[PDB]
Design a protein around this ligand. Sequence first.
Ligand code: CLA
Ligand code: CLA
Ligand code: CLA
Ligand code: CLA
Ligand SMILES: CC1=C(/C=C/C(C)=C/C=C/C(C)=C/C=C/C=C(C)/C=C/C=C(C)/C=C/C2=C(C)CCCC2(C)C)C(C)(C)CCC1
Ligand SMILES: CC1=C(/C=C/C(C)=C/C=C/C(C)=C/C=C/C=C(C)/C=C/C=C(C)/C=C/C2=C(C)CCCC2(C)C)C(C)(C)CCC1
Ligand SMILES: [Fe+2]
Lengths: 37, 37, 490, 34, 34, 340, 32, 32, 34, 65, 49, 35, 82, 37
Amino acid sequence: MEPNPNRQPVELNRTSLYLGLLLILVLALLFSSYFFN
Amino acid sequence: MEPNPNRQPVELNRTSLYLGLLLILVLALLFSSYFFN
Amino acid sequence: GLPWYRVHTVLINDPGRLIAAHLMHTALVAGWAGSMALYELATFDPSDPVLNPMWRQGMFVLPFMARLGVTGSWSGWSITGETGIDPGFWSFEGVALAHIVLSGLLFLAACWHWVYWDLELFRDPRTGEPALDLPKMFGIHLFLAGLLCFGFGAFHLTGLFGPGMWVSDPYGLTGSVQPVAPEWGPDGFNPYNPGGVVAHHIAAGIVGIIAGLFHILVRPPQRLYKALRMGNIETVLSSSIAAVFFAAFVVAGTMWYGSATTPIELFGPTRYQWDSSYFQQEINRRVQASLASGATLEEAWSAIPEKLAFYDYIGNNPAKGGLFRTGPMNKGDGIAQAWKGHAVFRNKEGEELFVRRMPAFFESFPVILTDKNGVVKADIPFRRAESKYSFEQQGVTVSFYGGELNGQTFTDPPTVKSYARKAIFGEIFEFDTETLNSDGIFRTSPRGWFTFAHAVFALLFFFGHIWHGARTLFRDVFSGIDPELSPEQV
Amino acid sequence: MEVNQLGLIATALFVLVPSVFLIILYVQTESQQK
Amino acid sequence: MEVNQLGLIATALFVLVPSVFLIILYVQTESQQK
Amino acid sequence: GWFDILDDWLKRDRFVFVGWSGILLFPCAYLALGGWLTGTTFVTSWYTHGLASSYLEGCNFLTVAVSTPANSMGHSLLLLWGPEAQGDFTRWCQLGGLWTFIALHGAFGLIGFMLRQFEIARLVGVRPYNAIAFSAPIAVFVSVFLIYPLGQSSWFFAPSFGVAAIFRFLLFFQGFHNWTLNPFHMMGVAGVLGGALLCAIHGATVENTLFQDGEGASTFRAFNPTQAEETYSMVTANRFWSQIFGIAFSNKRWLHFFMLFVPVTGLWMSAIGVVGLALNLRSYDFISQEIRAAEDPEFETFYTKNLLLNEGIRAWMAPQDQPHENFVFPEEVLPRGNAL
Amino acid sequence: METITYVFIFACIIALFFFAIFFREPPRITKK
Amino acid sequence: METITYVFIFACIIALFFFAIFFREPPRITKK
Amino acid sequence: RIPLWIVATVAGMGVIVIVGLFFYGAYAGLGSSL
Amino acid sequence: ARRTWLGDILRPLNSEYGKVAPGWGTTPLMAVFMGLFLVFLLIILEIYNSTLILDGVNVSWKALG
Amino acid sequence: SANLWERFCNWVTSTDNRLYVGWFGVIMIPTLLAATICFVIAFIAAPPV
Amino acid sequence: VSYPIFTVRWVAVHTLAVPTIFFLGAIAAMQFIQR
Amino acid sequence: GTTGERPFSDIITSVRYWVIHSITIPALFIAGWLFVSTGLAYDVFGTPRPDSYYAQEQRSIPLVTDRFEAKQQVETFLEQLK
Amino acid sequence: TITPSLKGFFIGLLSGAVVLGLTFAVLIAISQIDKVQ
Ligand code: CLA
Ligand code: CLA
Ligand code: CLA
Ligand code: CLA
Ligand SMILES: CC1=C(/C=C/C(C)=C/C=C/C(C)=C/C=C/C=C(C)/C=C/C=C(C)/C=C/C2=C(C)CCCC2(C)C)C(C)(C)CCC1
Ligand SMILES: CC1=C(/C=C/C(C)=C/C=C/C(C)=C/C=C/C=C(C)/C=C/C=C(C)/C=C/C2=C(C)CCCC2(C)C)C(C)(C)CCC1
Ligand SMILES: [Fe+2]
């Protein structure tokens, strides 16, 4: 097979990881109360 | 600071991933019964 | 390289893997359908279609399967409550089975189309580079749609070569799958007439077949092809989404307001039926009729079919409930067992009182009793210090007619107040709270959930449209702008 | 107390799954040569 | 049935956590230039 | 061709740019603003809510409003020439026709306006991130003034156009929907409150990290309208916050995108919450809390306290807030604490 | 709930199987 | 069980905080 | 030619007058309480 | 590229790529059905909203059986 | 076509198949698919025996 | 320059200017109604 | 920085403008005033006059209770000298 | 056939077209009175 020429690499910098995690965690801190209801 | 010269890169090939997952999944299929008891 | 939220742009012009992608998607949606069914079949109780129907057991997929014919199980039972019936292969199990397989096949297909992404069919003979002639495709697809649309209305809904669809009386008591004859008259545009759902698919189907051919032949006017940046697939998206959310906002409305497409015996009552005391009026009408034909109050009320009384209970109003009040309606008030009967309240003077019902808006509501003219005669006081209408001071009593408590009367204040406290919700019923370990807090019906989910998705999809649309008409200025300083001078 | 049984796993998977996603990327980014 | 309440989350985390580990590595390996 | 000539004229750079969009924007936008200003001073809400609602009756800028139609009307579009008003204008006014007028007109006016942004952007050749942003205010208007009442019994329960008439909409949602306890509303405020922070903080950060490009104290004149160097020390700003807050920006492109995201995402969440309040699918209670409060009379949280406040709001307001229900709540049935 | 968990894991192993057989790293000779 | 869940996430956010402040990517000037 | 600064201060007082009439009307009109 | 049986049979259907009609082609004719559709929707909408009543059409759970 | 059946036999016996469906395979592959599918369904939903 | 009079801006300006004053006049009269 | 329109500043300053608007502005004003003071506004908008909220005795509100026969119902509300 | 509300619908469908008319009338006209280049 021919190596598909439409692919690019993917990236996520350190800050984005942090900004990411902060969002996930706080959302969890916000919705957990309603999940346990 | 000086870039610490004791670091090497880490690797996990595709087969290892598979062999890994196979182990994790089947173990889970083996212990879940006892977890739910 | 690519940011996380762009990883899928790797397909913007790789028709092969784009098909490989949509194949996997379809596989998952078909897969979900199959397996969500099995989940319902493993938990749905057919033991009683009257007081414990699918819409009380938090069933979501099971109704959509009955609306088009599938109303039986290989195990013998059936949605309408009949026995000895032979659903054939197309039973709920069957449907569920089918989807699971169709998913597996679409999977394998998705795989093949991924590895063999560079088929020539996607390369333009002229430019020798990947390309898809959108305008002609749309024509093709649209032709197939209308062709299938036609068939659905023509053979399925009509019964010609199919089952039909769900049809019921004005008070969901007789409902079932029946062949529906078309309706091209004016009343065929009435949402509550089944004939309209048939005619539509035949008419729209044909128009769809016609319109399709046109687009397979006539080409897009230069002006347009330029304007609506055709030959650029990320615009087919912008338009599709706009249609998809349009469709969405509509189904959300027909589910909430009701239509021949969302029958109460499959999705539950409507909040507006409770608002206008819909079922309350049908009951009275019947009861007063029985009294005319010389029946006693006992006989009159006893004639009222349980199912009919059940719809006249606020615990089936989709407007009651909460966002995180999960599960079936049964985890709320409990599994309905029987109708205790109509409660008639009277005071020492013999006068008949009436319990002011609970408006959907109110989580909690006070117990107030008035006569025919609406004069407050009795109530349950907050501050007893100066209560003038306490059930005690008024000698309020309660009597029942037809049902569990039929022929009985209760006069001890506590017991009287208990039922009065219950009358507020309409017809009083007997629930089994044990089984599901209910908490006694109202939950909404599938009608309610479907309506909420789709009203949201739609409003969310609008943003998708506005976003993708923009990104198509501004592809050039994407990544940024450049030079000159013109502005304020034509 | 009288909470939801699935509350725990709903919160757990809600935290892990997407966090796990990010981490998978960051680390794969972090380890790209040059 | 009358199973353990934590059984579900115990099995879930037992599968995710270590699988998640591997995947993080594989993907970070996979994306190393040359 | 006339079209390109029609175009030509419209897209002409005037004082107040018209454009194709304008053919939709200006007619509606003016009618919406006009209808309000009309009702605000002349039309009454007597036959609709048993309320005086215009200057002509004695209402002031705060108490004035264009009240919703009766509950009898239902979700009727209430057209001037519809079954209700029957072409008559005065009747139309008294049946709250001016509400659906302002609503529906203003609705299209917001479509036109966003289209304008889209159209003007294209011409000037800039990116449409001003249009994306404006989706948030649309969602709000759409969900609150349309989707919400569309889920209720009628337009009567939509927010009436007016200052005070909006405060009761707030109080209502508290009392009946316990809206403040809703996860989506919270995100909402988090966005607006947090968005009003970014605004303030970034502004101040810039004005006090400026380079000196003039000899005056009033550094406003000292600005180069024609780009070139950064007018403020982005490098100094970074170090500042990095030492006082611990975290600090360092990519103006991201800092500015962030400023779009925060308040637009917030408003979107607050919308979803209301879209659920339409079906009354609220975030009213916590079941675990209620169950313990039932069995145990000494368990008290700031949550239980609030619910009692709601009970009072509903019981004391409902009568004159929902006339069509002919409510009569005897003094003895009215929930009340001690002495008060 | 338990049934779902058992079937899920099983389905995941079968998924693995597929990928392992048809999406392995091609076994290259000599020049590896 | 719930208490544990609430405190955990909180403890996780504070952990994040730490790493974000003291283990960020050093902000490099011009030649970036 | 009418000097701008006069156009303003005249149109200015003119507004304080009308808006002030409104404020008076609050203690006499229908918007009163008497 | 990679031709295939099915691929060739379908080759015609996908080839007329950039092919557009000249000038304002069918546009005006299209702009008529569009206006018709717009009016069509407004009708069925106003019928559902009971703004446009028509003896024979009873927009309720009734008119059913 | 060099002869359909002649080709068929050349494909089946082909040593260039990812999985060598043999002659025995022609009996194997179907029987094993029946066994597994029935099993998986039985083990999950079959009733008391 | 040789500026024109009736322009689009003019139109706009008046659609808001004319009614406004008409209202400010109306309201101003209301300040005297009583009972 | 410019377009065809004649710079407001010039116009708001032109003696011609005021010669026009000293007439026009107060005109509109006195008109609107009369609109209210002649009781016309009350009829154009069906707005009750201070003595037209209730009938002398009645203390009930003229709440419109049904859409289609609303206009008819409203008219009847004006009947009881309301 | 042709009920009062149906008559009103035409009245509104007609009074609407008119507005679209006069609007596009005026526009197309004034548009073709200046635009030199
Ligand atoms: C949208 C389609 C849909 C709909 C309408 C329903 C509807 C229903 N399902 Mg259901 N279901 C669906 C999809 C859907 N399902 C799917 C895809 C699955 C597979 C996972 C299931 C699996 C499922 C199960 C296993 C069960 C149901 C059940 C039910 C019924 C009970 C209602 C419920 O529990 O509400 C619950 C509603 C919620 C808790 C609301 C979720 C809202 C979340 C919290 C918002 C998230 C916000 C987000 C994080 C914010 C971030 C944004 C920010 C970053 C910008 C109900 C009829 C139950 C049933 O059988 O009843 C007997 C049941 O047991 N469903
Ligand atoms: C072999 C073909 C096939 C068949 C016969 C069915 C049949 C069925 N499916 Mg189904 N399904 C299929 C393929 C099929 N599916 C595939 C490939 C998928 C994956 C995408 C699904 C996914 C799926 C799900 C997720 C669900 C079903 C469900 C159902 C059942 C309810 C049907 C329903 O009401 O549809 C509703 C039909 C519509 C959505 C209307 C479509 C009309 C759109 C809005 C118009 C599109 C615009 C159009 C192009 C404009 C041009 C038209 C022109 C004429 C003017 C029914 C038994 C439901 C069920 O109850 O679960 C088992 C269900 O939840 N299916
Ligand atoms: C019709 C469906 C549809 C389709 C096919 C696409 C397709 C696409 N969108 Mg998209 N989009 C849609 C709807 C759709 N969108 C809607 C409704 C919105 C508004 C909410 C958006 C908002 C949007 C934005 C803001 C962007 C895109 C982008 C893109 C492109 C890159 C996708 C990407 O790599 O994501 C990557 C996906 C992931 C790695 C993250 C997904 C995480 C989600 C949010 C969690 C939920 C997962 C869950 C399974 C979803 C359930 C599905 C639900 C609908 C039933 C791609 C062409 C991007 C693009 O333009 O790039 C330049 C881009 O920036 N879209
Ligand atoms: C162009 C901007 C614009 C837009 C989009 C609207 C839009 C609207 N106005 Mg409106 N309006 C405008 C300008 C505009 N207006 C202006 C400038 C004025 C001042 C004169 C008004 C004054 C006004 C009033 C007084 C009222 C409205 C109302 C309405 C709404 C309902 C009217 C309706 O049913 O239309 C119907 C749509 C059409 C007539 C479009 C038809 C287009 C087709 C292509 C022509 C076909 C004609 C042909 C004869 C049909 C052949 C079919 C055959 C079978 C008979 C609607 C939202 C009503 C409302 O607010 O109710 C609450 C209302 O009472 N408007
Ligand atoms: C291969 C094959 C096969 C098999 C197949 C199968 C077995 C399949 C399965 C499949 C499946 C079994 C699938 C499933 C799917 C599912 C899904 C896809 C789901 C999803 C979900 C979701 C997405 C959700 C979400 C959510 C949440 C989570 C919460 C919130 C809300 C919401 C809803 C959003 C056979 C043998 C036939 C043969 C051929 C081959
Ligand atoms: C309704 C309607 C319509 C319309 C009409 C119109 C369009 C109107 C307009 C109107 C208007 C357009 C009005 C206006 C008004 C205004 C006013 C009345 C104003 C006032 C102001 C003031 C008072 C000010 C104040 C102030 C401020 C705010 C700031 C600070 C300072 C001062 C103090 C200055 C039509 C017929 C179409 C149809 C039917 C319906
Ligand atoms: Fe800035």
